[PDB]
Structure 1
Amino acid sequence: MKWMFKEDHSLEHRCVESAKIRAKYPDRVPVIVEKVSGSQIVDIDKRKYLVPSDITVAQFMWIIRKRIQLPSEKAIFLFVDKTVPQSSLTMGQLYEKEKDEDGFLYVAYSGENTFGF
């Protein structure tokens, strides 16, 4: 799963970026969102989010659904470190458990992708 964000920035650049935003907004978590390479679901305009730590994974999935205007009768999935995150975790909890070494949390999403993940 190539991540454009990582391709676009050095590891050091990403570390200082997340560190600055974590020091400055301690109640929020920095998140990169990318659709699954090769999947059929519509793409999302913005990749980089500052998400309140107290909202749940389930609620973040609804924010993403709204950002891509996914009709309600289509399914969406999020994936973090190769697995489906627990929907009832808060984003702060998910961040602490699955954050990248660069200090960002990387969330991929797809629809019912015929090609899996």
Structure 2
Amino acid sequence: EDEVDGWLIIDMPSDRPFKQRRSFADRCKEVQQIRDQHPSKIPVIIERYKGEKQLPVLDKTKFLVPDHVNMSELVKIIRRRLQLNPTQAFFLLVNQHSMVSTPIADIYEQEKDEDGFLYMVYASQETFG
């Protein structure tokens, strides 16, 4: 959402989140093709949490993940790419809850968006729920 700590966050279009820069038809079409071409891989969107104030910005948004890699392994990969030390808090959240040894393929069938992408947000703090 566009609401963070009582602020309505307005962004220029190219600074908006993936779901707002790209139409649903365009997202769904891209998933369908990537699932055809790489059925052994999960299409994942990883974005910095709108209100993150500590963690650096990731150079990629779209990730094609081998489907038997588990969540704990994806975290290490993203931690490694952001060159985070093990003492820095880092959370990779799927629909607002944190990642776990379940294969990403199970998570995808359980938590994928209507457009067929799996959405994830990273942040230095867990969100209460």
Where do 5+ consecutive residues of structure 1 fail to align? none
Q: Report the equivalent of 1:93.
A: 106
Q: Deviations over 1:31-70 (max 9, x none)?
A: 0000111112111110100000000000000010011111
The match for 1:58 is 72
Provide, for residues 77-103 of structure 1, a one-character-per-residue CA deviation record: whole Å limited to 9, x for no partner.
111112224x11111111111000001
Tell me which of the two structures has the higher relative contact order, counting C-alpha pairs closer than 8 angstroms and 6 or more residues apart: 1
The partner residue of 1:17 within 21, 27, 30 is 30
The aligned residue for residue 102 of structure 1 is: 115
- The sequence identity of aligned pairs, in percent, is 39
Where do 1:40-79 residues align within 5 Å?
40-79=54-93
Q: Does 1:31 align with 2:38?
A: no
**Paired residue secondary structure (1:14):** helix
Letter in 1 for 2:91: F
- Structure 2 residue runs of 5 or longer lacking an equivalent are 3-15
Letter of the structure 2 residue corresponding to residue 66 of structure 1: R
The total of aligned residue pairs comes to 114
Which protein shows a greater Rg? 2
